[PDB]
C-alpha cells in the first residue's frame, strides 16, 4: 500500500543515444547591439 | 496622427542614442547598455523639417489601435 | 462498501511535461487606455 501510485512504475528506455541539442544554434553570429 | 511627437532612436552600432523632437536633432552617447553619464555634451542640431520626421508603416489599419504583425497572429497554429 | 464510487479509482498519468501556457500571451503590448 505504501508504494507510490498504484505500483505501475515505469523504466525510461533509450536507443543508445546521448543527444546534442546545440548543432545549429551556436553558428549564429551576433549582428545586433549585444542585448 | 500622421507623424509622431517625441521619438527615441537607437543606432545599430550601439554607441549613439538620439531623440527626435520637432525641429532639433538631439544626440547622446551609449558606451554601455544601461548608463547615461552626464559628463558628455549633448549635441543639438537644427536641421529644420517641421514635425518629427518619422512615418509609420502600419501592417493592418484598425479603429482602436491594437497594431499587430502577421507573425504574432498565427503563433498558436505554428 | 465505504470506498468512494464503485472502487474504480484512476491515476493521472503524464508524458514527463510541466507545461507553460503563457508563451505567446505576454508578448502583447497594451495599445489602449489601460482598462
Amino acid at each position: 500500500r505504501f508504494k507510490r501510485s498504484g505500483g505501475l512504475m515505469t523504466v525510461s528506455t533509450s536507443r543508445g543515444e546521448e543527444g546534442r541539442p546545440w548543432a545549429g544554434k551556436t553558428a549564429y553570429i551576433r549582428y545586433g547591439d549585444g542585448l | 496622427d500622421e507623424y509622431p511627437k517625441y521619438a527615441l532612436e537607437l543606432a545599430n552600432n550601439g554607441k549613439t542614442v538620439r531623440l527626435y523632437t520637432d525641429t532639433d536633432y538631439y544626440e547622446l552617447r551609449m558606451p554601455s547598455p544601461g548608463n547615461f553619464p552626464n559628463e558628455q555634451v549633448i549635441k543639438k542640431v537644427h536641421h529644420g523639417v517641421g514635425v518629427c520626421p518619422f512615418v509609420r508603416y502600419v501592417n493592418m489599419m484598425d479603429l482602436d489601435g491594437f497594431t499587430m504583425g502577421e507573425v504574432e497572429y498565427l503563433v498558436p497554429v505554428a
Side-chain angles (χ1 to χ4, degrees), chain A, chain B:
Chain A
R1 180 176 64 89
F2 308 93
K3 302 211 59 54
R4 278 80 178 271
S5 82
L8 318 171
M9 58 87 71
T10 59
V11 290
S12 65
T13 67
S14 164
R15 217 183 75 179
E17 183 49 59
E18 299 296 325
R20 308 140 195 80
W22 44 75
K25 184 189 178 295
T26 181
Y28 152 76
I29 299 102
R30 188 47 171 207
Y31 284 156
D33 289 328
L35 271 297
Chain B
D1 279 333
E2 296 176 354
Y3 302 107
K5 195 173 194 333
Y6 311 114
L8 194 61
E9 205 266 357
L10 157 72
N12 54 0
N13 55 11
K15 193 72 52 176
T16 57
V17 167
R18 42 202 79 175
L19 188 136
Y20 284 24
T21 181
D22 52 356
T23 49
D24 295 319
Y25 178 82
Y26 276 85
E27 183 143 28
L28 287 93
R29 286 275 313 203
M30 200 73 194
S32 166
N35 59 346
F36 274 72
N38 48 2
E39 55 171 72
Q40 203 262 338
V41 169
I42 320 291
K43 278 192 62 45
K44 305 171 197 177
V45 179
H46 174 60
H47 45 279
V49 72
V51 296
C52 182
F54 277 134
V55 186
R56 177 150 52 82
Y57 280 59
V58 54
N59 183 22
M60 59 171 38
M61 261 306 299
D62 281 8
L63 210 60
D64 52 343
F66 276 41
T67 292
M68 63 183 179
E70 291 292 327
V71 63
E72 184 198 14
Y73 185 71
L74 286 78
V75 160
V77 63

